[PDB]
mmCIF file of N, CA and C and ligand atoms in Angstrom:
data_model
loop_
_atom_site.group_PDB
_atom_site.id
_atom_site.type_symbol
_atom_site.label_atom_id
_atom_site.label_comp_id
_atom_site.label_asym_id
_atom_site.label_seq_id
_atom_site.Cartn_x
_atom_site.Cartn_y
_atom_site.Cartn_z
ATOM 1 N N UNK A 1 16.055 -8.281 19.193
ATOM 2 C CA UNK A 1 15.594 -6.865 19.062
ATOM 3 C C UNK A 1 14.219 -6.701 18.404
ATOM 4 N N UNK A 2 13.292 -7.045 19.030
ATOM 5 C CA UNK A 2 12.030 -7.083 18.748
ATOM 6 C C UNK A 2 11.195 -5.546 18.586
ATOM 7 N N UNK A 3 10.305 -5.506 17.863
ATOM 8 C CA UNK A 3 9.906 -4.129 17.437
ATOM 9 C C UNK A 3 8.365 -4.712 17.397
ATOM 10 N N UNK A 4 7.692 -3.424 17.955
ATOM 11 C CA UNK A 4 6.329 -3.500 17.292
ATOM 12 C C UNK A 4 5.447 -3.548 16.048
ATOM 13 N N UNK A 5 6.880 -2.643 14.965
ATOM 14 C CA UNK A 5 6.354 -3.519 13.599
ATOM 15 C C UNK A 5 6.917 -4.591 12.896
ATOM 16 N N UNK A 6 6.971 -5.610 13.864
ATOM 17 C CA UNK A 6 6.471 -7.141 13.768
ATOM 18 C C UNK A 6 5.410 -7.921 13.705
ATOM 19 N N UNK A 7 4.863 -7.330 13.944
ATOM 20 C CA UNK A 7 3.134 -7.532 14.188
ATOM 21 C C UNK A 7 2.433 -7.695 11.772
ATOM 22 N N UNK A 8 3.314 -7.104 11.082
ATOM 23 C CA UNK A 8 3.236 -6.616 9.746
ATOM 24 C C UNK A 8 4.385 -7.536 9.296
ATOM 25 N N UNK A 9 5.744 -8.230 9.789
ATOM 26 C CA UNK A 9 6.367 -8.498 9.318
ATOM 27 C C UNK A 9 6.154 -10.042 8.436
ATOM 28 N N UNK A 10 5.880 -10.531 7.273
ATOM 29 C CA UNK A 10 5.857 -11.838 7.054
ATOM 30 C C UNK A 10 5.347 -11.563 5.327
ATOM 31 N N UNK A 11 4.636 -12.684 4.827
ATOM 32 C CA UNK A 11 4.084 -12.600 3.145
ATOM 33 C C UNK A 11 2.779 -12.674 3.337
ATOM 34 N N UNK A 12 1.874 -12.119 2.860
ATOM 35 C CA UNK A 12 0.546 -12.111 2.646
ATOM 36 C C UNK A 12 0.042 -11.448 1.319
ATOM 37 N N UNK A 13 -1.199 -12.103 1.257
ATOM 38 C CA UNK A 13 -2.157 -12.297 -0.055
ATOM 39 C C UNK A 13 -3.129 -11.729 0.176
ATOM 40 N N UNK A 14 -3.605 -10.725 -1.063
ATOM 41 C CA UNK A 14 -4.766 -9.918 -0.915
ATOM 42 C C UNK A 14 -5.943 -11.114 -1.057
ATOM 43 N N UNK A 15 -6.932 -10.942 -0.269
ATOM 44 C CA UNK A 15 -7.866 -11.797 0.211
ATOM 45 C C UNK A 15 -9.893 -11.080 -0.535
ATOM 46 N N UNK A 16 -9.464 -9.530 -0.507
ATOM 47 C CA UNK A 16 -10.620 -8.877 -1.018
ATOM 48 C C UNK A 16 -10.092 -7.428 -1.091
ATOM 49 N N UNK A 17 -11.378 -6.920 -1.757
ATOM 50 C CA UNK A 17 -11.241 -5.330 -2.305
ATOM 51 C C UNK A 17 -11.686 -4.783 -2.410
ATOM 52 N N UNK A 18 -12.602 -3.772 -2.059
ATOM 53 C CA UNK A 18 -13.615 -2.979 -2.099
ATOM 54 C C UNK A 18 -13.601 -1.555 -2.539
ATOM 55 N N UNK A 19 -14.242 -1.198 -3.513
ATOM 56 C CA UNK A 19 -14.113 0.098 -3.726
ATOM 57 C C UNK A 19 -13.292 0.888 -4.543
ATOM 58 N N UNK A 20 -11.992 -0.203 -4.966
ATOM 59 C CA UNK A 20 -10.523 0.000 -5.342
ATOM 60 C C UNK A 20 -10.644 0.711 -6.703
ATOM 61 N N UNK A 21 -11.853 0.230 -7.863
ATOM 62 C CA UNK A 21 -11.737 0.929 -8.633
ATOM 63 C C UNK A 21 -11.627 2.783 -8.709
ATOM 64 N N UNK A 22 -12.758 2.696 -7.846
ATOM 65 C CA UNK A 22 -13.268 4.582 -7.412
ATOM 66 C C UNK A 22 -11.997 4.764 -6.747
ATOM 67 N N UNK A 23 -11.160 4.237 -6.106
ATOM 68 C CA UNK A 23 -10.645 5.150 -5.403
ATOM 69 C C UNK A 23 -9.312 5.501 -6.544
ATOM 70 N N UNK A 24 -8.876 4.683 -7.576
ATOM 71 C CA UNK A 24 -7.929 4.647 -8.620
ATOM 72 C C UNK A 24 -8.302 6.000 -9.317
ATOM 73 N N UNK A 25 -9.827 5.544 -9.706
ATOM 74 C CA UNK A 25 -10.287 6.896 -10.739
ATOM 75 C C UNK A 25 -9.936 8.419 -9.933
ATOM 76 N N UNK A 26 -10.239 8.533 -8.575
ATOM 77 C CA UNK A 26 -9.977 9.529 -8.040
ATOM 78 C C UNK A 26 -8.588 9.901 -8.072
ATOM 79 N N UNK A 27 -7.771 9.051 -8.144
ATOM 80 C CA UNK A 27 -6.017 9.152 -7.818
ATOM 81 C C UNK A 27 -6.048 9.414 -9.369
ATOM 82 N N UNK A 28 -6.605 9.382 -10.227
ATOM 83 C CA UNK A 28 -6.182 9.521 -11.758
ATOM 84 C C UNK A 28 -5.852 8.438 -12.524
ATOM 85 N N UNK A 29 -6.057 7.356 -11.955
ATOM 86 C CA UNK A 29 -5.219 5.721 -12.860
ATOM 87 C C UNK A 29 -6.577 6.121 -14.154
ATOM 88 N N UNK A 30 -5.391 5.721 -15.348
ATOM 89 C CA UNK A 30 -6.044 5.598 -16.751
ATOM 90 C C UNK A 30 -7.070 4.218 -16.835
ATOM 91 N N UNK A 31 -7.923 4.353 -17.558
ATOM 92 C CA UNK A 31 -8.643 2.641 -17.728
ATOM 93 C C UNK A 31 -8.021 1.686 -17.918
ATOM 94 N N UNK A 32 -7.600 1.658 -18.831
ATOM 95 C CA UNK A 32 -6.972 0.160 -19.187
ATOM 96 C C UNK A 32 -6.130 0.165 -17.584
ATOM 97 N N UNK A 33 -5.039 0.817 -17.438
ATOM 98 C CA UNK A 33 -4.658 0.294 -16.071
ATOM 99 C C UNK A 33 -4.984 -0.131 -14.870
ATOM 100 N N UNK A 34 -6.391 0.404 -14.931
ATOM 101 C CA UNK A 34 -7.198 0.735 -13.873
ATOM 102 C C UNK A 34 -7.727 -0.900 -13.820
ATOM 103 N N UNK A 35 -8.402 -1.634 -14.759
ATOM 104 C CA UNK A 35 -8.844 -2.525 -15.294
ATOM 105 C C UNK A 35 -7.455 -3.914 -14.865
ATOM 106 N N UNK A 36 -6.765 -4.102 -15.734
ATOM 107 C CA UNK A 36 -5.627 -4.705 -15.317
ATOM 108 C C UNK A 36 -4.726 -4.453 -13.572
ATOM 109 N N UNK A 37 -4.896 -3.303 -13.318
ATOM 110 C CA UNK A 37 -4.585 -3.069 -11.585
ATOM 111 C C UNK A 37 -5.505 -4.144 -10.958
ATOM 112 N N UNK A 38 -6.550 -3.915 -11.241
ATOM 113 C CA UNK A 38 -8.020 -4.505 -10.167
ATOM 114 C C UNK A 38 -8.060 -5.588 -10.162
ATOM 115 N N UNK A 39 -7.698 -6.423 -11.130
ATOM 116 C CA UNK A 39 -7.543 -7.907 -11.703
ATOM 117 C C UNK A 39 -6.247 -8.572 -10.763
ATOM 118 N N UNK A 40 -5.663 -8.113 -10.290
ATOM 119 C CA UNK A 40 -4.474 -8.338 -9.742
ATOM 120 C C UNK A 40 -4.637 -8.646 -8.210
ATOM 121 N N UNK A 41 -4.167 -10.008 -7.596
ATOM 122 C CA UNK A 41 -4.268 -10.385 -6.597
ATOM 123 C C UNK A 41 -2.625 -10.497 -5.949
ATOM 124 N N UNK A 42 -2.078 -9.188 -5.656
ATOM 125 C CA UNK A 42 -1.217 -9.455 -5.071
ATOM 126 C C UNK A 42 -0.360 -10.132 -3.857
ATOM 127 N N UNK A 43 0.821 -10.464 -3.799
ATOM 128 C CA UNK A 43 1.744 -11.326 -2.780
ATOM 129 C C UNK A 43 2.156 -9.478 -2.164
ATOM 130 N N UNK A 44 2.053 -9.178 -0.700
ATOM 131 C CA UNK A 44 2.938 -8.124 -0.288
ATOM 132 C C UNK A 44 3.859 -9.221 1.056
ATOM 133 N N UNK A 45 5.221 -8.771 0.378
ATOM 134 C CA UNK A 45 6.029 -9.191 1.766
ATOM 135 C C UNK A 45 6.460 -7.938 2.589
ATOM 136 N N UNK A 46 6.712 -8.160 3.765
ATOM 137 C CA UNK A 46 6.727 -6.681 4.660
ATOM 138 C C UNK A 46 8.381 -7.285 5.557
ATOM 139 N N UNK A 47 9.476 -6.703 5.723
ATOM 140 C CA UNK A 47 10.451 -7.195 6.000
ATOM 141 C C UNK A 47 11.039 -5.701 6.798
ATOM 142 N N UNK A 48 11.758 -6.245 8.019
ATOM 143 C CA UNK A 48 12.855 -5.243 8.499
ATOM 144 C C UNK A 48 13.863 -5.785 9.021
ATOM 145 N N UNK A 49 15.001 -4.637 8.780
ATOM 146 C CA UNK A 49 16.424 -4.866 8.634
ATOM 147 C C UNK A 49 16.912 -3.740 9.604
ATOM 148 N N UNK A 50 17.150 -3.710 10.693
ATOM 149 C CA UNK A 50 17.414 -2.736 11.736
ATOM 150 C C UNK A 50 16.251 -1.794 11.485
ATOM 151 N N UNK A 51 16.688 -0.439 11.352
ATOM 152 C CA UNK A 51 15.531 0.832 11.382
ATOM 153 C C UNK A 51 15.257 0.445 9.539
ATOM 154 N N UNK A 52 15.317 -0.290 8.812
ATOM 155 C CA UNK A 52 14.931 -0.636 7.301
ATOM 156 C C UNK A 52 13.083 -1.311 7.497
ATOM 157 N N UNK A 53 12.325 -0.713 6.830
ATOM 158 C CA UNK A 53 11.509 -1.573 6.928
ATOM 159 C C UNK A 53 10.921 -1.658 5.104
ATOM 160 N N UNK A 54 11.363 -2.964 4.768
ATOM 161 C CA UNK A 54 10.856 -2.827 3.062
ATOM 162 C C UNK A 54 9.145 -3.590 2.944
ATOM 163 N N UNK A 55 8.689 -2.928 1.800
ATOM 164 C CA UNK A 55 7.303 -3.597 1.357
ATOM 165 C C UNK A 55 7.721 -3.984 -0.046
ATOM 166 N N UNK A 56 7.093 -5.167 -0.227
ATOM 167 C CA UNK A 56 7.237 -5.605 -1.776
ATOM 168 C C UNK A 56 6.099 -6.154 -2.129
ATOM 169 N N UNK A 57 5.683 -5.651 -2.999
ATOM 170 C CA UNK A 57 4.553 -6.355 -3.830
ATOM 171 C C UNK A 57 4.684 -7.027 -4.833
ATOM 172 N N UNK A 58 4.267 -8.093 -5.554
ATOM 173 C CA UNK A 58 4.578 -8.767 -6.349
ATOM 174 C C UNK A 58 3.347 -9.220 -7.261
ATOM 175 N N UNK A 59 2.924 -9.289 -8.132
ATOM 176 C CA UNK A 59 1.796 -9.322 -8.886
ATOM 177 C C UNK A 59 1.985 -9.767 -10.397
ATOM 178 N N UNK A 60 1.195 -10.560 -11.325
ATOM 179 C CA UNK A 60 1.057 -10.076 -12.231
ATOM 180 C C UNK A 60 1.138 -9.175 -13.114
ATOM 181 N N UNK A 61 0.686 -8.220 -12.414
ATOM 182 C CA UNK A 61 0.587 -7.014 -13.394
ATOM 183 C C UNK A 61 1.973 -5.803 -12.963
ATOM 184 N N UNK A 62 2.083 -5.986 -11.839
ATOM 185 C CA UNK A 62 3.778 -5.073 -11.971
ATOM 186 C C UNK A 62 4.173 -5.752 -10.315
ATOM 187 N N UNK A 63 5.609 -5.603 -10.632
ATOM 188 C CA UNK A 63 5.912 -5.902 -9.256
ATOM 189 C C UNK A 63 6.383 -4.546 -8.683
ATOM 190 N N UNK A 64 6.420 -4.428 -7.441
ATOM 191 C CA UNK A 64 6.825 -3.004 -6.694
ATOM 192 C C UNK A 64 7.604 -3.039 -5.274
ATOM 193 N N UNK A 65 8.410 -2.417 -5.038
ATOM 194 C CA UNK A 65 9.018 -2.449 -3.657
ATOM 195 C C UNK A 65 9.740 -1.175 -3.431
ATOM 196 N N UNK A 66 9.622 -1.015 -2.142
ATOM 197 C CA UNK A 66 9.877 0.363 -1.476
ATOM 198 C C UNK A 66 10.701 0.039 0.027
ATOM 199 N N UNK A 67 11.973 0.553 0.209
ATOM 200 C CA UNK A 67 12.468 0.652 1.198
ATOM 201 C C UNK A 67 12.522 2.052 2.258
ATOM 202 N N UNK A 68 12.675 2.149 3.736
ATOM 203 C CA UNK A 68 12.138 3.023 3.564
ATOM 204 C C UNK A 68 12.424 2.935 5.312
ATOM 205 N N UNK A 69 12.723 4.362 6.076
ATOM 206 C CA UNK A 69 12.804 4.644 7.807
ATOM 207 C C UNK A 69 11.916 5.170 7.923
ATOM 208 N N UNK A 70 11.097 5.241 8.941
ATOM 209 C CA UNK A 70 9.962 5.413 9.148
ATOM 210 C C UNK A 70 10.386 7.228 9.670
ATOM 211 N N UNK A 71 9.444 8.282 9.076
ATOM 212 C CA UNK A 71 9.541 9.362 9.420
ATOM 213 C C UNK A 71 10.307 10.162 8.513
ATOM 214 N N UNK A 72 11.332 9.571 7.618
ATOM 215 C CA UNK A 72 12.169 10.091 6.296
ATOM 216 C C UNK A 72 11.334 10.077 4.856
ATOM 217 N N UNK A 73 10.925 11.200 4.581
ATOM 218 C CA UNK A 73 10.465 10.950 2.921
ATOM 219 C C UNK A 73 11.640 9.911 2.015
ATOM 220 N N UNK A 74 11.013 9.822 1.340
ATOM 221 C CA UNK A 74 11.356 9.081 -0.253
ATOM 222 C C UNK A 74 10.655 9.129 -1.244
ATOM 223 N N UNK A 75 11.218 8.449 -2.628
ATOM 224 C CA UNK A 75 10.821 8.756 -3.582
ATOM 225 C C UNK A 75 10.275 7.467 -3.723
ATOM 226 N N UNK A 76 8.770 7.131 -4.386
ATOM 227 C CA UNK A 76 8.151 6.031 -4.641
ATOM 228 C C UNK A 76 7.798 6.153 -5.929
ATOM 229 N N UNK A 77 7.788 4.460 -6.563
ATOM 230 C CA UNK A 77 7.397 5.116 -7.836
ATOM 231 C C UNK A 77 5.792 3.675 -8.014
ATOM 232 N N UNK A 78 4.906 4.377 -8.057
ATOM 233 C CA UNK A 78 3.447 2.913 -7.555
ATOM 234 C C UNK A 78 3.243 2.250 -8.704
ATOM 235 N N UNK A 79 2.284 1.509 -8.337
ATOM 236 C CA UNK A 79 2.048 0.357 -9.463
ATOM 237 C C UNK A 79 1.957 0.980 -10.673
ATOM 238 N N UNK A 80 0.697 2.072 -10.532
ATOM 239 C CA UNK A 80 0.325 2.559 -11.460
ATOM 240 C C UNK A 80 1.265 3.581 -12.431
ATOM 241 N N UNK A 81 2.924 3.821 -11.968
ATOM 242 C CA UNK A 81 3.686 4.405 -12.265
ATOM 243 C C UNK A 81 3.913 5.791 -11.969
ATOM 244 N N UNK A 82 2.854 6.493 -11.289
ATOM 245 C CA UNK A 82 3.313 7.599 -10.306
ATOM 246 C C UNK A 82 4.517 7.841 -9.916
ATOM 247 N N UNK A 83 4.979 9.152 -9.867
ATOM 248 C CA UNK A 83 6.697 9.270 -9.694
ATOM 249 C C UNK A 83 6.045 10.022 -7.997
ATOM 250 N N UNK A 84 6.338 9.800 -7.028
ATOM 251 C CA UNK A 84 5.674 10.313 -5.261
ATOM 252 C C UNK A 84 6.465 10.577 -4.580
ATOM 253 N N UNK A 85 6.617 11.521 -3.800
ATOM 254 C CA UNK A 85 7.298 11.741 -2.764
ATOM 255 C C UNK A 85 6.500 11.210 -1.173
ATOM 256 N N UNK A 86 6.754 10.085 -0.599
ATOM 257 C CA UNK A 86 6.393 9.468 0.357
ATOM 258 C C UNK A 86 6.821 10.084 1.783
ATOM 259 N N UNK A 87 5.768 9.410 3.086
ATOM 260 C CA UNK A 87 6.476 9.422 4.030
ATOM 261 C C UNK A 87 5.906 8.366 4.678
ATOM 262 N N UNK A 88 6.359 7.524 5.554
ATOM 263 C CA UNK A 88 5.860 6.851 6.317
ATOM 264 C C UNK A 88 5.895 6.491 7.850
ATOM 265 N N UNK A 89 4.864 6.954 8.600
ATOM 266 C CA UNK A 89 5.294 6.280 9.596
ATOM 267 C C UNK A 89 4.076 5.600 10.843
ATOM 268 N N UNK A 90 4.465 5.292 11.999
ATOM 269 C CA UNK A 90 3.520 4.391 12.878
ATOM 270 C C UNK A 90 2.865 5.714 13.763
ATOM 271 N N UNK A 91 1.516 5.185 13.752
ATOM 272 C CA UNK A 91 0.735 6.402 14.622
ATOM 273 C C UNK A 91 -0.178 5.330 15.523
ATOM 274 N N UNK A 92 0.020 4.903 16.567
ATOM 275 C CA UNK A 92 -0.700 4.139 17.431
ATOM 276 C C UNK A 92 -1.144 3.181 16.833
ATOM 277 N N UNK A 93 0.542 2.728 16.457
ATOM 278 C CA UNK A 93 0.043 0.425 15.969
ATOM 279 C C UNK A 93 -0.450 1.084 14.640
ATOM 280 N N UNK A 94 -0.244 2.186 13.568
ATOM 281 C CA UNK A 94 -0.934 2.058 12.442
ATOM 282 C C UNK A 94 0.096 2.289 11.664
ATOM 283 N N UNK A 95 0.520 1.530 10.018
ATOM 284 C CA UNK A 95 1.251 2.235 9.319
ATOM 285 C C UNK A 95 0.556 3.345 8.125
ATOM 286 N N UNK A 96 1.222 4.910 8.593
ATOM 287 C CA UNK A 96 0.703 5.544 8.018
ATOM 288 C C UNK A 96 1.496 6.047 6.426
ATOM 289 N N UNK A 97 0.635 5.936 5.436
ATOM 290 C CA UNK A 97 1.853 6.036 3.948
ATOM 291 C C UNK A 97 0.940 7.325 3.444
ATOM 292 N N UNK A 98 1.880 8.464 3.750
ATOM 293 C CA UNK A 98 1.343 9.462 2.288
ATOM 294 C C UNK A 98 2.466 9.774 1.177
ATOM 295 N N UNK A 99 1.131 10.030 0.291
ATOM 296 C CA UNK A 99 2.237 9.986 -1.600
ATOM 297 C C UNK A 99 1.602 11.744 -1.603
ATOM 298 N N UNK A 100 2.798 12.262 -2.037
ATOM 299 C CA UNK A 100 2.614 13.921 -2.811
ATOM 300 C C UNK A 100 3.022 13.341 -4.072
ATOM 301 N N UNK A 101 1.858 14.302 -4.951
ATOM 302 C CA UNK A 101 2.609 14.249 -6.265
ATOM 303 C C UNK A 101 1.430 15.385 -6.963
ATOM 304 N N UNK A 102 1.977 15.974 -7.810
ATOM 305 C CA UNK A 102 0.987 16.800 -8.911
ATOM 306 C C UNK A 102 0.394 17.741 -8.102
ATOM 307 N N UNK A 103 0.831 18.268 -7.006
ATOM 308 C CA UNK A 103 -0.084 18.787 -5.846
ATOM 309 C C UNK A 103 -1.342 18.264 -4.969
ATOM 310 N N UNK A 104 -1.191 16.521 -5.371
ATOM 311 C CA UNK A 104 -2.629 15.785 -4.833
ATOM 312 C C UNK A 104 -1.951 14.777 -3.712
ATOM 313 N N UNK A 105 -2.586 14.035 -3.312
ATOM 314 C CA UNK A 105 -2.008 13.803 -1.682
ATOM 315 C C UNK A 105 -2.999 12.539 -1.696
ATOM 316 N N UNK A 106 -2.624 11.698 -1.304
ATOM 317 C CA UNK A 106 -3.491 10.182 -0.602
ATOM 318 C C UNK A 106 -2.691 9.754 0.516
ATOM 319 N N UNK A 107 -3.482 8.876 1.025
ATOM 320 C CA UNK A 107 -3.495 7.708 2.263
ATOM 321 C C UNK A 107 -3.849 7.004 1.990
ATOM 322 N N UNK A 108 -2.319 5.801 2.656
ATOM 323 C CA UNK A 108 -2.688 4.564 2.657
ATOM 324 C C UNK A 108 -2.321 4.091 4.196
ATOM 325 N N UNK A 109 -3.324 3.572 5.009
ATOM 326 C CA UNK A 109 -3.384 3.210 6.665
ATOM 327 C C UNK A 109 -3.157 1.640 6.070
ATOM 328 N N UNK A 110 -2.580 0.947 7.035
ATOM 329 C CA UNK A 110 -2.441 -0.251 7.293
ATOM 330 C C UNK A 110 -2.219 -0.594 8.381
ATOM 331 N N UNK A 111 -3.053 -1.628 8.805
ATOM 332 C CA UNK A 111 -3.252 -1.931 10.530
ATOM 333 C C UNK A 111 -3.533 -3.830 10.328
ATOM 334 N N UNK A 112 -3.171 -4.212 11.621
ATOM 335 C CA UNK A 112 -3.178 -5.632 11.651
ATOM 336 C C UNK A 112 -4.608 -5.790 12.449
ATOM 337 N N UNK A 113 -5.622 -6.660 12.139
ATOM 338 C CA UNK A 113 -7.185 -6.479 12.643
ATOM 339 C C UNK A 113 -7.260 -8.159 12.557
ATOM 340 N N UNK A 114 -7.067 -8.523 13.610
ATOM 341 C CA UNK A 114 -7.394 -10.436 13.989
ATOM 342 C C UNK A 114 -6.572 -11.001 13.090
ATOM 343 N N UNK A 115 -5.908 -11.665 12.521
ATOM 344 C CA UNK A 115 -5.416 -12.619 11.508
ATOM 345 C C UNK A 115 -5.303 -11.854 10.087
ATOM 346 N N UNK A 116 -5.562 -10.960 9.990
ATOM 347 C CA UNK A 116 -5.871 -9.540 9.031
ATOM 348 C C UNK A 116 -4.653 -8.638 8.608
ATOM 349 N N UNK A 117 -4.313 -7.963 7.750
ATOM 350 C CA UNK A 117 -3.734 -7.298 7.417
ATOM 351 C C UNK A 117 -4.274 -6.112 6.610
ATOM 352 N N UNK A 118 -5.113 -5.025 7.116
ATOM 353 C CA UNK A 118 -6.283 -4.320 6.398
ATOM 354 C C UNK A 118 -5.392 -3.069 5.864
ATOM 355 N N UNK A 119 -5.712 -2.636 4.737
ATOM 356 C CA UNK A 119 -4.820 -1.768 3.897
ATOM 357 C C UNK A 119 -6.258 -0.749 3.860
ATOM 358 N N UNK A 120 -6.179 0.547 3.715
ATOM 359 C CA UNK A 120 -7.144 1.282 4.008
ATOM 360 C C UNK A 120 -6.660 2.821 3.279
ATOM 361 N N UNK A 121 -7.131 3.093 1.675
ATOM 362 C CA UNK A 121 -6.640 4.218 0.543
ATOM 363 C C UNK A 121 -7.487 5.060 0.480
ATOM 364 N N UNK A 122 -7.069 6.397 0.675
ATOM 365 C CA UNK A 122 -8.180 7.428 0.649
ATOM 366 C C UNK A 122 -7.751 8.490 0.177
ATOM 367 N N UNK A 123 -8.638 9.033 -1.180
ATOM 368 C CA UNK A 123 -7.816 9.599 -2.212
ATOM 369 C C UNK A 123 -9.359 10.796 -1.821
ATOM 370 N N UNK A 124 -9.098 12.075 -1.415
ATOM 371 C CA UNK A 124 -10.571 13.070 -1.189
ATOM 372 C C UNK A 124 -11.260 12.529 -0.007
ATOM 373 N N UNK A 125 -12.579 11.945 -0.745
ATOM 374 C CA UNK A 125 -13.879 11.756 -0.057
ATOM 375 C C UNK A 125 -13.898 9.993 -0.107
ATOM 376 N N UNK A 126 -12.917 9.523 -1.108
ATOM 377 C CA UNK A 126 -13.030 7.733 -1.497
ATOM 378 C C UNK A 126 -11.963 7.308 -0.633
ATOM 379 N N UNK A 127 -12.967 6.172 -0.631
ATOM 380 C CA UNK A 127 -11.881 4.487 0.791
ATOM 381 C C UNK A 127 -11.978 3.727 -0.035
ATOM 382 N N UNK A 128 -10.710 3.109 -0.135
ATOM 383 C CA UNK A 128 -11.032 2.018 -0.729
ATOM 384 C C UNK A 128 -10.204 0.593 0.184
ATOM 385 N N UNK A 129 -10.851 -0.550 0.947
ATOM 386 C CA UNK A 129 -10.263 -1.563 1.743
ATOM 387 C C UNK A 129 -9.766 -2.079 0.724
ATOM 388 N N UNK A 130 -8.690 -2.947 1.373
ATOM 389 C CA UNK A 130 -8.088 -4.009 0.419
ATOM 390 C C UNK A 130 -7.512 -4.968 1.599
ATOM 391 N N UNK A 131 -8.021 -6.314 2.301
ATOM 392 C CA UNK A 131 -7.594 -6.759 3.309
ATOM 393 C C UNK A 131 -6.679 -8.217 2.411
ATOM 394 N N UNK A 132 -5.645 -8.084 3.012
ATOM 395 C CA UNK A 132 -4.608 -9.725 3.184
ATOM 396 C C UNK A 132 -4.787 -10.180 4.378
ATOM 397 N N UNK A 133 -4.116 -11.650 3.711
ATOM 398 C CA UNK A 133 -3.902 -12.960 4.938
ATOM 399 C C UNK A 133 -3.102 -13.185 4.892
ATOM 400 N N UNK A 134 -2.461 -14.036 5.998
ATOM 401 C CA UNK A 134 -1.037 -14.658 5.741
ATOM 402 C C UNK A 134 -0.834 -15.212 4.635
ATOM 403 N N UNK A 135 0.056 -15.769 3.892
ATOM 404 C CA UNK A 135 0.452 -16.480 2.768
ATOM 405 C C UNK A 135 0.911 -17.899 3.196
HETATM 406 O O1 W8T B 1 -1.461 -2.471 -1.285
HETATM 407 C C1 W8T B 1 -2.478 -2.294 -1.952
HETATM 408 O O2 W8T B 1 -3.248 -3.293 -2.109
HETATM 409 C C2 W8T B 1 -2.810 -0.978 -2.613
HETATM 410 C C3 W8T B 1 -2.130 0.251 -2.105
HETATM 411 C C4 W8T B 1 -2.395 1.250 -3.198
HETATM 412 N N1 W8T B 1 -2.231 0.449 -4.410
HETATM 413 C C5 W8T B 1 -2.484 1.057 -5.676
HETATM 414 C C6 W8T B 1 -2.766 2.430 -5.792
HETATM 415 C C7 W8T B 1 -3.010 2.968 -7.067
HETATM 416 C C8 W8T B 1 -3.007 2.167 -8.217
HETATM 417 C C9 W8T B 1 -2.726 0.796 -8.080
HETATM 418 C C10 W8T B 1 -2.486 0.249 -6.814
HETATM 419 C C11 W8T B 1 -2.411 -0.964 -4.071
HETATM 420 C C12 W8T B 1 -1.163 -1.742 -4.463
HETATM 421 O O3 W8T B 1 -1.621 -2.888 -5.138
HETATM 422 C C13 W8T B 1 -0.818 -3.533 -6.061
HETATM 423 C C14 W8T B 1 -1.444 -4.256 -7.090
HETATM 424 C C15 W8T B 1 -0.567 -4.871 -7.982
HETATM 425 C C16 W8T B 1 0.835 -4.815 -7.796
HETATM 426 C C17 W8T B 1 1.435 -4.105 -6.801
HETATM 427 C C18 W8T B 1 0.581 -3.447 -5.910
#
């Protein structure tokens, strides 16, 4: 029973990062966290279990995981400790993640780009990339 988000399914390692600080400050992350977040080269594993599709991050600095049907809100709680009401789902081969919280709203796109796993956060007017590789 093969699915198209297979293409995401496996362990990968953040590889680079661009921008990540600005786009934190915009989302509100405090300094020191902000500082210790950025420093952090996370493991994300991406796994599905019938209509289940979980993300786990694993890091140094906090570990995180979210289960989750694509198109059903949930409650997320992020690295940075944000309490979010999520939704997620696929928009032409893309995974699309928005967080409500405090009345403020981000995106996070994730798309598979050659051997790539490009994570793509946009908090206003700020992007911030963050691409993995396989592990
Ligand atoms: O997936 C990504 O790279 C982005 C997605 C957004 N996000 C984030 C957003 C606001 C504040 C901190 C992180 C990253 C998650 O990164 C981590 C880093 C360490 C441990 C777990 C996850």
């Amino acid at each position: 029973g093969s699915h198209m988000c297979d293409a995401f399914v496996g362990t990968w390692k953040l590889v680079s990062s661009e921008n990540f600080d600005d786009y934190m400050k915009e989302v509100g992350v405090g300094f020191a966290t902000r500082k210790v977040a950025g420093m952090a080269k996370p493991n994300m594993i991406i796994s599905v279990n019938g209509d289940v599709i979980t993300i786990k991050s694993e890091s140094t600095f906090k570990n995180t995981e979210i289960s989750f049907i694509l198109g059903q809100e949930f409650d997320e709680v992020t690295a940075d400790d944000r309490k979010v009401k999520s939704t997620i789902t696929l928009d032409g081969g893309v995974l699309v993640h928005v967080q409500k919280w405090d009345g403020k709203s981000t995106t996070i796109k994730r798309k598979r780009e050659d051997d790539k796993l490009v994570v793509e956060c946009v908090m206003k007017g700020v992007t911030s990339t963050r691409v993995y590789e396989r592990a």
